[PDB]
Scaffold this active site. Structure first.
Site, PDB file in Angstrom:
ATOM      1  N   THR A 126     -51.273 -24.016   6.336  1.00 48.16           N
ATOM      2  CA  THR A 126     -50.470 -24.438   7.313  1.00 48.16           C
ATOM      3  C   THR A 126     -49.859 -23.438   8.229  1.00 48.16           C
ATOM      4  OG1 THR A 126     -49.138 -26.317   6.222  1.00 48.16           O
ATOM      5  CG2 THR A 126     -47.648 -25.100   7.652  1.00 48.16           C
TER       6      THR A 126
HETATM    7  B1  LIG Z   1     -49.367 -26.422   4.898  1.00 47.25           B
HETATM    8  O1  LIG Z   1     -50.856 -26.300   4.398  1.00 47.25           O
HETATM    9  O2  LIG Z   1     -48.662 -25.524   4.035  1.00 47.25           O
HETATM   10  C1  LIG Z   1     -49.054 -28.025   4.433  1.00 47.25           C
HETATM   11  C2  LIG Z   1     -47.696 -28.090   5.143  1.00 47.25           C
HETATM   12  C3  LIG Z   1     -47.002 -29.475   4.664  1.00 47.25           C
HETATM   13  C4  LIG Z   1     -45.497 -29.817   5.035  1.00 47.25           C
HETATM   14  C5  LIG Z   1     -47.721 -30.643   5.255  1.00 47.25           C
HETATM   15  N1  LIG Z   1     -49.179 -28.178   3.021  1.00 47.25           N
HETATM   16  C6  LIG Z   1     -49.987 -28.909   2.512  1.00 47.25           C
HETATM   17  O3  LIG Z   1     -51.039 -29.317   3.084  1.00 47.25           O
HETATM   18  C7  LIG Z   1     -49.851 -29.102   0.970  1.00 47.25           C
HETATM   19  C8  LIG Z   1     -50.920 -28.241   0.173  1.00 47.25           C
HETATM   20  C9  LIG Z   1     -50.516 -26.859   0.349  1.00 47.25           C
HETATM   21  C10 LIG Z   1     -51.103 -26.252   1.289  1.00 47.25           C
HETATM   22  C11 LIG Z   1     -51.028 -24.814   1.406  1.00 47.25           C
HETATM   23  C12 LIG Z   1     -49.872 -24.146   0.714  1.00 47.25           C
HETATM   24  C13 LIG Z   1     -49.108 -25.204  -0.107  1.00 47.25           C
HETATM   25  C14 LIG Z   1     -49.531 -26.400  -0.185  1.00 47.25           C
HETATM   26  N2  LIG Z   1     -50.352 -30.725   0.755  1.00 47.25           N
HETATM   27  C15 LIG Z   1     -49.417 -31.554   0.317  1.00 47.25           C
HETATM   28  O4  LIG Z   1     -48.377 -31.175  -0.090  1.00 47.25           O
HETATM   29  C16 LIG Z   1     -50.191 -32.767   0.010  1.00 47.25           C
HETATM   30  C17 LIG Z   1     -51.466 -32.778  -0.099  1.00 47.25           C
HETATM   31  N3  LIG Z   1     -52.275 -33.959  -0.046  1.00 47.25           N
HETATM   32  C18 LIG Z   1     -51.136 -35.226  -0.227  1.00 47.25           C
HETATM   33  C19 LIG Z   1     -49.819 -35.117  -0.289  1.00 47.25           C
HETATM   34  N4  LIG Z   1     -49.591 -33.627  -0.193  1.00 47.25           N
END
Ligand SMILES: *[B]([O])([O])[C]([C][C]([C])[C])[N]C(=O)[C]([C]C1=[C][C]=[C][C]=[C]1)[N]C(=O)C1=[C]N=[C][C]=N1
Ligand SMILES: *[B]([O])([O])[C]([C][C]([C])[C])[N]C(=O)[C]([C]C1=[C][C]=[C][C]=[C]1)[N]C(=O)C1=[C]N=[C][C]=N1
Ligand SMILES: *[B]([O])([O])[C]([C][C]([C])[C])[N]C(=O)[C]([C]C1=[C][C]=[C][C]=[C]1)[N]C(=O)C1=[C]N=[C][C]=N1
Ligand SMILES: *[B]([O])([O])[C]([C][C]([C])[C])[N]C(=O)[C]([C]C1=[C][C]=[C][C]=[C]1)[N]C(=O)C1=[C]N=[C][C]=N1
Ligand SMILES: [Cl-]
Ligand SMILES: [Cl-]
Ligand SMILES: [Mg+2]
Ligand SMILES: [Mg+2]
Ligand SMILES: [Mg+2]
Ligand SMILES: [Mg+2]
Ligand SMILES: [Mg+2]
Ligand SMILES: [Mg+2]
Lengths: 204, 226, 212, 195, 196, 233, 222, 196, 195
Positions: free
Chosen positions: E1
């Site tokens: 993210t």
């Molecule tokens: B980002 O990569 O931090 C992102 C922001 C979120 C608000 C959409 N998080 C995610 O994609 C997370 C995984 C993750 C990645 C990097 C750091 C921490 C967490 N994904 C999920 O929460 C997720 C993934 N698949 C289905 C549902 N939720």
């Protein structure tokens, strides 16, 4: 350790032409030790039949529970519970213990008294309904039963032919399982008569 | 499991395969994965079967009571909010992965829901073990301004990709179309590309083949008069 | 598995079951748990199927080499000790064996040695080995005498396996009987438990618990 | 504790239960009675984890005695066994389950029949002609399978029981210091003082 | 993210990528991580999608109820409500949130709330896995009182690099502009920002 | 036993009427960091074989040197090194397959998934897979990593069985491969836009295409997507 | 941690006739929930009228078959082109398997052919080399589904003759090659329905005194 | 650790911080991570100090023995010797090394060798814990064929940021210039590079 | 195996060793002789892990018998015990150590004195008036501390040994199926057939 395979046992159900059949082995054991050869796993509440595999204490507990509930149902409704309704009751009852489940593999079988339609259903230990047209299997030799049923079964079998098919499905499946056997019972169920048959099988 | 949802001109379509599995064994060959939350709000479920069923019935029940309380047809966002807050509370332990779709007075809607309670919006979505096979088809063939006929075709093609290429998916394709200003049409077994061929042999036994010890009539009737 | 062997007036009785399992799955009901090492030596098999098989047919090669070199039948003591010394080299590695080496020689008479993958080598009159050994012991100990006829001894061994085949979930299939004298072993047939149980129940009046 | 046996014959139920109480290294007692009279015609033997065994047995005893006074009536062995099973079935999903296995030998005065029930700590009930808990069954069931006939007399039952105890004394590693034998019949419960 | 909020002369701008990942699978390539808790108080979400949604939903509820009683809340107040949830439930949450808002009195403000639940008021803030790669760039290129066009270019170039290097980040660059003029949404596609 | 450090993602491939196509992106990832953007993961061997490698890049570079050394060794005392006794795809594969299985058997694997694509002496298409476990299989379409899950479904719609191979032209096959690469760029978080593609045809020989890019991407619809459910602005 | 083993699924089936033998096996190859190949041959002609299949972990399966084929070659060199009998092949395979007793070939091996009297023969092995001649054996993923069906329909287990009621067993009449192939096809059709790792295609190798013949049949591809 | 090597018009320049840490304690604040394996082939060291010293010592031995037999080795040859050690002993080593050298034929060359033991020839390279924070900055600001003064400024500004954000990096910025003119050592102190 | 005892009296050494051989669940044999004659006037009893015990004992026996033939001379009990200790002390740092504890009872014909050595699997040697291995000592050493006077006769030694075995039979949980007693004196080694 695995609760679903401490006591052992199997149940199988099939549909035929204007009839259903449900069958079970008679073994109860403590892992390797065979304890009882009279432990029946099929019970009935009115014209609705319930087979239960898995942990024996829960098999007994659930039988006593569904007897309890079907008796109150009958007093209030002023009629016997039907297989479709009972299936939903089993599902409700099992799911209420979602995170502390009964370690069982229930199998409902019976004929709807009003429509005359043959009915069978299976469940996992937590309530999911498997409502198959052809057959339902459950227990420690479920894989074996799946193989037997999938090859031996054909639709619209007459009661006395269906008896032969389900009996051979159970017997040959049980003989490939260490924790199943020690006798067997088959119920042949028609709209207003039920025949119960004890099968002669190898006692090892 | 392969479940998909596809938006189109005047509504939304969802689809699903019909295979349920316990490990490498097929428990049910014709499983019903399309659930009705309300007359015009349907969702497809992946993951733990009892959970997708139970969580749908509960929210569908409360949605019905809510609709009666408010004298209004239910909204997809209401089902979405109630589902996500329930799933979040249980911290992912209720293993329900849902694609929620429907039409209501606001319009047509398509959402996904995961077990931990996160929601996503889209024109096309897919969930389950065959979601990658399905999403490959959706990413290759999806476009804006799809017709009803094109959306059903795309949705069922995405499910088929799951059926054939994912071992966790198989058997038949169920579809449900929810168009604006119309009744939702539930197309159970829309496609049936996996009928078993005739067996080589009949295994009907000669009567008297099985050895019997005892016979008896079971008394299913009540206690009798006189 | 249930295997037994006992010394008596008429030599040695060896009796074994036929079942092989992988977990709760019955892999085979037709397993030969008795090895014919030579016309005079028998070995029983319990535990790991392959370990017992491989090393007991290997034992037969070592016994043959002995009598080629020494121009004389190998003793039961020497044969059993070759096997026990072999498995002792592999101790800790994870071999899984419970075996009786049974034979008759002039100098020893009828002799039985319990050999074990932990290195245990014991001479004795009666042995039962396997998951169903305790069941077989019950019948054997209450009915054993030195003065048994070859016919009665054979039945006791058959009956003791049947007892275990019934109760022990990991025993069953069928019963293989052997009778060892000073002119060699003599096979006494494969007896299916599915037919033997009902036969014994009826004729003996036993198993009144079970319904037939 | 260790070995508890039960055998139902023609007109009585016989329960045999070891006398040893071993706490790890030493045998603290060699005359322990691992049984409680629940009612005049119902006896329960028990074996399991220390403390839990007696605590459970006495708790069941108290409940049945309470029932007997309230109704001025003796519960059937079947009824008592069902009550006991429910307590154990309740217990197994508790914070700390009762780790107790039991045999309930009773004479039903209504049906004029002896009855033997085997119940384990999970609440697994079975009615049997003969039963055992722990490693006892592994040695004894083979003998009982062979010799038991259901028309046996009490004296024949005791002889068959001696054959079981002899086999246990021969093949079991633990010295259980013999057994206390008790007979349950139409006349009530009595102890065989010489065994 | 890759998320960031940047104050400038006329107010504040929030920026974010659109990638949601389950391991290496991109579950959603067109995610909206810029979310609204009040008319002119928005937040950027990083970490668990479920946790940050649940939090944001609760905050929006609190600020809606605040508004009904006490009128429009300050950006500081919004950040405090976020903090209270993130701090008191730190053991069970995985949420990195940037709060950004526009008052007429206070103008553009940015508060960052990392994992711990601590609050930090800053001229600009960066967060998410992809932020690590642009600390150097952002520190060197940030100025106070930039114009709207300069701030959009600053965010666009920054997140472009964060996307380029971070596998967890990607898709479109979403932006939300908060000024006295109102609320403007901006989007920038791969073909535009990759060639920068 | 090790763990992979610098890694390459999917390698996708398929057969068509006169030969085989193989493709793989130019990325060398370092965990979630997209570290190296100019890594060639298709390595040609002669003018009749291309070896596509995914997984650990240090082990890829080792394999690359083995193949380079294999050509050198084959030329030794071999007057027909550029003719009848030239290296075949089947020879190159079996060699790698032997090495992979030997290394796994010593509990020190080359942490890779390999696809050998080529055309034999008799004009037959060669396409076979091998990985760190020594597992081998052949199919009209083959793919590694994420490609297995997303590319194969798309490529199998073109060539579903053996009888579809003669009906598939090089234009249709390449189109399918290029589309699959786009799909992987949408959905694989460890992929890149830049990739290489190789065609081994029995008539036109080996065509090696570098510096290709994923194009014709759909992103416009993103502008309409707002919030995660109830949000309207 | 590195796991040297994997599961490639599949299922195999050997049936011994009176003067013939069949060794069948599905052509699907998988890992986890993905299909690797819909047609990856699993049953091999190893020469000397012997057919073989090592089902389970395909890398160990291919290695074993490769080494046995090699053993047949060297048996001819070392013993004046003598035909390797099926019983001798079986014992040779036991030693191949046990040679890796402490790092096993994770496979379920079955060979089929004709014994020295010309009768049908099937031998079955566990991963570590224990073996046994059998009339009937299924191996692999769906072995638990198929074996009970074969106990019933090949050895007529639990079947008796009508009218006698359990007294007289069904006589063990021999099965023709056409009858066996029907049972093989129905076994795999049934196994495909209820097992996710079974499908795509069925390849049967039939061994007679005339040689080794092949037959292929389609299976469901879901 | 923050290390980098950058090729430019006249050759190549190696740059490094001077911090060695045992956890949070700075064991050495004036470390020399720029080390010489041949007259005009140097390397930057990151990771284990013991491992990278042991490796560098062995490489210097190999190139000294190479020189005695076959004359001056190429930078590629030096990188290959580093690779052979790092790859074949990957299970027991923790070494991230950047090899940089100057030929007259090949001019300035830079090879990076990360943990795995793979080799990557690049125009410039960055490595060490502190490199993560300057990927964005370095990618945006690097040009090919820079002057000596421009390259020194590029390295100085880059490592300045890497030091600013990374706790493992700090102290003085050491640099080594490799050209046809010879070998020049440069040093830059905190008071100089912190105000950038 | 389980219980091995030793007691050195005026003119002899007496070794008592249990007869039971148990494998987990069952008692396979009740007449096992857990001893080997190393030389005409030296006896070694042993107890430890299965297989290792006999393998070690017979290996020591062979070595001493080899020495006896080579030199046409019997080693002193002290010398034999030192040889045995070194083998175990070597063994404990091996790939797979011998898991064997031993008692060496011998009569030194040169000094005309009985000698009892206790050696554990680590190679820990001690000369004692009375010794034991395993849990035996926990019960028996108190009795021997009280009753042992050093000038006892062989018959008094056997009576004191009976008192030890009786205590073990009373308080130990395991049924060791009695003991085989052997006496080592100036006339050599003999077995007490009735005990
Ligand atoms: B980002 O990569 O931090 C992102 C922001 C979120 C608000 C959409 N998080 C995610 O994609 C997370 C995984 C993750 C990645 C990097 C750091 C921490 C967490 N994904 C999920 O929460 C997720 C993934 N698949 C289905 C549902 N939720
Ligand atoms: B699909 O693969 O997600 C499918 C959809 C389901 C809603 C019908 N899931 C299943 O079939 C699950 C897979 C599963 C197995 C084990 C744990 C959790 C999930 N199956 C079941 O829930 C299941 C298993 N056995 C009996 C009944 N239901
Ligand atoms: B018997 O039960 O010990 C038996 C004897 C063996 C010679 C056939 N062993 C087995 O059945 C073992 C499992 C086992 C069960 C109970 C105790 C000990 C071991 N089975 C196998 O070794 C085996 C071999 N091939 C296939 C399946 N199982
Ligand atoms: B740098 O931080 O990577 C640095 C480079 C080294 C060549 C001087 N490494 C260290 O300071 C290491 C610890 C470390 C930090 C960051 C990543 C990896 C390793 N320190 C040591 O090796 C060390 C510390 N104290 C005494 C001796 N060696
Ligand atoms: Cl989100
Ligand atoms: Cl250093
Ligand atoms: Mg059975
Ligand atoms: Mg049995
Ligand atoms: Mg019980
Ligand atoms: Mg959470
Ligand atoms: Mg990216
Ligand atoms: Mg299938």
């Amino acid at each position: 350790s695995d609760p679903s395979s401490i006591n052992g046992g199997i149940v199988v159900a099939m549909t035929g032409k204007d009839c259903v059949a449900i069958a079970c082995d008679l073994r109860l054991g403590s892992q390797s030790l065979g304890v009882s050869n009279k432990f029946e796993k099929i019970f009935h509440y009115g014209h609705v039949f319930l087979g239960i595999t898995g942990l024996a204490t829960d098999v007994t507990t659930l039988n006593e529970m569904f007897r309890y509930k079907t008796n109150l149902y009958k007093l209030k409704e002023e009629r016997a519970i039907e297989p479709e309704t009972f299936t939903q009751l089993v599902s409700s009852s099992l799911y209420e213990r979602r995170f502390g489940p009964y370690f069982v593999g229930p199998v409902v079988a019976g004929i709807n008294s009003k429509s005359g339609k043959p009915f069978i259903a299976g469940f996992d230990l937590i309530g999911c309904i498997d409502e198959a047209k052809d057959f339902i299997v459950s227990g420690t030799a479920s894989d074996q039963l799946f193989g037997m049923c999938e090859s031996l079964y054909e639709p619209n079998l007459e009661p006395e032919d269906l008896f032969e098919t389900i009996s051979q499905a159970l017997l040959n499946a049980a003989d490939r399982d260490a924790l199943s056997g020690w006798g067997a019972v088959v119920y042949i169920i028609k709209k207003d008569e039920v025949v119960k048959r004890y099968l002669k099988m190898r006692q090892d | 499991t392969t479940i998909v949802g596809v938006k189109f001109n005047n509504g939304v379509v969802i689809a699903a395969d019909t295979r349920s599995t316990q490990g490498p064994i097929v428990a049910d060959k014709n499983c019903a994965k399309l659930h009705r939350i309300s007359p015009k709000i349907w969702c497809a479920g992946a993951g733990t079967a009892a959970d997708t069923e139970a969580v749908t019935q509960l929210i569908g029940s409360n949605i019905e009571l809510h609709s009666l309380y408010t004298s209004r047809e239910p909204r997809v966002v209401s089902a979405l909010q109630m589902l996500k807050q329930h799933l979040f509370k249980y911290q992912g332990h209720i293993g329900a992965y849902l694609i929620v779709a429907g039409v209501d007075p606001t319009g047509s809607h398509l959402f996904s829901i995961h077990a931990h309670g996160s929601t996503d919006v889209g024109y096309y979505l897919s969930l389950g073990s065959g979601s990658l096979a399905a999403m490959a088809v959706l990413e290759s063939h999806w476009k804006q301004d799809l017709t009803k006929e094109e959306a059903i075709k795309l949705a069922s093609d995405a499910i088929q990709a799951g059926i054939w290429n994912d071992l966790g998916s198989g058997s038949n394709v169920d579809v449900c179309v929810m168009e604006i200003g119309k009744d939702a049409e539930y197309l159970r077994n829309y496609l049936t590309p996996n009928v078993r061929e005739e067996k080589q042999k009949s295994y009907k036994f000669p009567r008297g083949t099985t050895a019997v010890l005892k016979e008896s009539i079971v008394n299913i009737c009540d206690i009798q008069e006189e | 598995t249930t295997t037994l062997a006992f010394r008596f007036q008429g030599g040695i009785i060896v009796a074994v079951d036929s079942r092989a399992t992988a977990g709760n799955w019955v892999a085979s009901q037709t397993v030969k748990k008795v090895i014919e090492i030579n016309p005079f030596l028998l070995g029983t098999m319990a535990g790991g199927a392959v370990d017992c098989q491989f090393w007991e047919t290997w034992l037969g090669s070592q016994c043959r080499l002995h009598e080629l070199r020494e121009k004389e039948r190998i003793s039961v003591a020497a044969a059993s000790k070759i096997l026990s010394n072999l498995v002792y080299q592999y101790k800790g590695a994870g071999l899984s064996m419970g075996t009786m080496i049974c034979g008759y020689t002039r100098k020893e008479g009828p002799t039985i040695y319990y050999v074990d993958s932990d290195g245990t080598r014991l001479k004795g009159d009666i042995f039962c080995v396997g998951s169903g050994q305790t069941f077989a012991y019950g019948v054997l100990d209450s009915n054993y005498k030195w003065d048994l006829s070859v016919e009665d001894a054979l039945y006791l061994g058959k009956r003791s396996i049947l007892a275990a085949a019934h109760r022990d979930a990991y025993s069953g299939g069928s019963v293989n009987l052997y009778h060892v004298t000073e002119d060699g072993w003599i096979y006494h047939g494969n007896h299916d438990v599915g037919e033997l149980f009902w036969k014994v129940k009826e004729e003996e009046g036993s198993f009144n618990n079970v319904i037939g | 504790m260790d070995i508890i046996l039960g055998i139902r014959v023609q007109d009585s139920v016989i329960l045999a239960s070891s006398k040893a109480v071993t706490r790890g290294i030493s045998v603290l007692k060699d005359s322990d009675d691992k049984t409680r009279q629940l009612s005049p015609h119902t006896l329960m033997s028990f074996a399991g984890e220390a403390g839990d065994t007696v605590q459970f047995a006495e708790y069941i005893q108290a409940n049945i005695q309470l029932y007997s006074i309230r109704e001025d009536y003796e519960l059937s062995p079947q009824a008592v066994s069902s009550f006991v099973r429910q307590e154990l079935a309740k217990s197994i999903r508790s914070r700390r389950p009762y780790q107790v296995n039991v045999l309930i030998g009773g004479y039903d005065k209504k049906k004029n029949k002896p009855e033997l029930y085997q119940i384990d700590y999970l609440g697994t009930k079975v009615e049997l002609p003969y039963g055992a808990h722990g490693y006892s069954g592994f040695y004894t069931f083979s003998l009982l399978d062979h010799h038991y006939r259901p028309d046996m007399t009490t004296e024949e039952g005791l002889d068959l029981l001696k054959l079981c105890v002899q086999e246990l004394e021969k093949r079991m590693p633990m010295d259980f210091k013999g057994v206390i034998v008790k007979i349950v019949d139409k006349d009530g419960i009595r102890q065989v003082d010489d065994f | 993210t890759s998320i960031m909020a940047v104050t400038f002369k006329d107010g504040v701008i929030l920026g974010a990528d659109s990638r949601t990942t389950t391991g290496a699978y991109i579950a959603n390539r067109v995610t909206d991580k810029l979310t609204r808790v009040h008319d002119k108080i928005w937040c950027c979400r990083s970490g668990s999608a479920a946790d940050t949604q649940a939090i944001a939903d609760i905050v929006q509820y609190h600020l809606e109820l605040y508004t009904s009683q006490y009128g429009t809340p300050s950006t500081e107040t919004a950040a405090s409500v976020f903090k209270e949830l993130c701090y008191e439930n730190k053991d069970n949450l995985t949420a990195g949130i940037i709060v950004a808002g526009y008052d007429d009195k206070n103008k553009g403000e940015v508060y960052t709330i990392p994992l711990g639940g601590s609050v930090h008021k800053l001229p600009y803030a960066i967060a998410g896995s992809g932020s690590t790669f642009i600390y150097g760039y952002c520190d060197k290129n940030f100025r106070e009182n930039m114009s709207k066009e300069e701030t959009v270019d600053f965010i666009k170039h920054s997140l472009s690099q964060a996307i380029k290097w971070d596998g967890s980040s990607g898709g479109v660059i979403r932006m939300v502009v908060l000024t006295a003029a109102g609320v403007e949404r901006l989007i920038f596609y791969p073909d535009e920002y990759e060639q920068l | 036993t090790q763990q992979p450090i610098v890694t390459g993602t999917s390698v996708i491939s398929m057969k068509y009427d006169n030969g085989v196509i193989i493709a793989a992106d130019n990325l060398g990832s370092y965990g979630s960091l997209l570290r190296f953007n100019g890594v060639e993961r298709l390595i040609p061997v002669g003018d009749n074989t291309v070896v596509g490698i995914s997984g650990d890049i240090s082990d890829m570079q080792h394999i690359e040197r083995l193949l380079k050394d294999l050509v050198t060794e084959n030329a030794y005392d071999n007057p027909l090194a550029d003719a009848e006794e030239a290296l075949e795809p089947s020879y190159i594969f079996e060699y790698l397959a032997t090495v992979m299985y030997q290394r796994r058997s010593k509990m020190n694997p080359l942490w890779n998934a390999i696809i050998v694509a080529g055309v034999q002496s008799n004009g037959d298409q060669f396409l076979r897979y091998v990985n760190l476990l020594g597992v081998t299989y052949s199919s009209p379409t083959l793919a590694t990593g994420f490609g297995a899950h997303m590319a194969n479904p798309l490529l199998r719609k073109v060539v579903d069985r053996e009888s579809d191979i003669p009906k598939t032209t090089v234009q249709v096959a390449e189109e399918a491969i290029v589309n699959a690469m786009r799909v992987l760029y949408y959905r694989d978080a460890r992929s890149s836009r830049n990739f290489s593609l190789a065609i081994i045809d029995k008539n036109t020989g080996l065509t090696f295409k570098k510096n290709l890019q994923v194009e014709n991407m759909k992103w416009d619809f993103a502008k309409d997507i707002k919030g995660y459910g109830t949000q309207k602005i | 941690q590195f796991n040297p083993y994997g599961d490639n699924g599949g299922t195999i089936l050997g049936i011994a006739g009176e003067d013939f033998a069949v060794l069948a096996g599905d052509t699907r190859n998988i890992t986890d929930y993905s299909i690797n190949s819909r047609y990856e041959p699993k049953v091999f002609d190893c020469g000397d009228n012997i057919v073989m299949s090592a089902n389970g972990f395909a890398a160990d399966g291919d290695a074993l078959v490769k080494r046995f084929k090699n053993s047949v070659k060297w048996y001819h060199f070392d013993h004046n082109d003598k035909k390797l009998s099926i019983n001798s092949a079986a014992r040779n395979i036991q030693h191949l398997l046990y040679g890796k007793r402490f790092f096993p070939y994770y496979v379920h091996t079955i060979i089929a052919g004709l014994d020295e009297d010309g009768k049908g023969a099937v031998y079955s092995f566990d991963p570590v080399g224990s073996y046994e001649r059998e009339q009937c054996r299924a191996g692999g993923a769906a072995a638990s589904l198929i074996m009970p069906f074969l106990d019933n329909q090949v050895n007529f287990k639990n079947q008796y003759e009508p009218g006698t009621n359990g007294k007289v067993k069904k006589p063990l009449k021999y099965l023709s090659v056409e009858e066996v192939i029907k049972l093989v096809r129905d076994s795999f059709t049934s196994a495909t329905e209820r097992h996710i790792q079974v499908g795509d295609g069925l390849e049967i190798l039939i061994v007679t005194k005339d040689g080794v013949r092949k037959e292929f049949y389609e299976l469901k591809r879901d």
